[PDB]
Write a protein that binds this DNA or RNA. Sequence first.
DNA 1: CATTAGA
DNA 2: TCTAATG
Length: 327
Amino acid sequence: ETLNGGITDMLTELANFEKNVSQAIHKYNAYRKAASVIAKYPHKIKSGAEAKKLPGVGTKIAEKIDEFLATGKLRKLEKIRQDDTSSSINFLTRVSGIGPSAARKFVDEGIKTLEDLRKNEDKLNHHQRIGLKYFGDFEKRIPREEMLQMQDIVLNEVKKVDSEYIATVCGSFRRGAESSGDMDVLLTHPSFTSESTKQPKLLHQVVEQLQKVHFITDTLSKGETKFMGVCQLPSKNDEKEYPHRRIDIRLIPKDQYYCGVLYFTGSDIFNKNMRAHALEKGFTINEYTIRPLGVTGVAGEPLPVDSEKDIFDYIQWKYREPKDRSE
DNA sequence: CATTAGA
DNA sequence: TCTAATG
Ligand code: NA
Ligand code: NA
């Protein structure tokens, strides 16, 4: 956690590189298992060799470790950090919709800069066009102050269209967080569950609403269960307009909300731990359900959940407010 | 790890 | 169809 930091950190630097700049899934996959293990290791790694004793720790990595252990640097790390080509990939990737594949192709063409990107909006698809359009806006954090306003709004439409609609604003926001990145609305409705062969309009109606009013300014992708877009707070009695925010809404079968809702709310650790727990308590939890455990090794049978509580009860825990879902 | 675009 | 990019 701190005794092995530089190593694990240099390591992930290295891995992340091979995966992005190069197309070395393997090497990249290497650095990470290694970075994983040394991370675990209970002691100040004193030399490559000591490291080396490790599972996943070959001679390549060991070698790197020593150089780093001796000199607070690495050449390959220094070189990479400089490398414009590679610097460029790392950067283009920030554009929502730009991935590494694209990040490289772009380069190979010579689109290294943001401006490059503009001169060739043509070479870009709608996703990436939007990514570029709201570049500043997409990187900025979401004041919970604004979050509250946003939420107030969707809750208003959802209800307005059908009173039957259930919507939860999951995430860190949910967990009380001061700021957030993007809004995440978990959606569901009674007339939609596990079996009852969809009702796509169910999602659709709402999006239409939210646009209708100008909350949703754009569509990144909208499918029959998952919409991906952009929203915006009505820029008041002017002088101050609002930033374009990322927003994501998802239709859920009523019979899987709470697990889902449980889940998206997190935190990443609260989950595992909660998950690890259900396990002892003779269970299994995952993004949609909770099934009692059978001793034959495994077992099925989806337990019935009417709220975040049922799930707690089941595995018999203390109801933990989203506030304290930290870990 | 599953859902959407796109080509 | 596969392959990408997001969460
Ligand atoms: Na070893
Ligand atoms: Na990106």
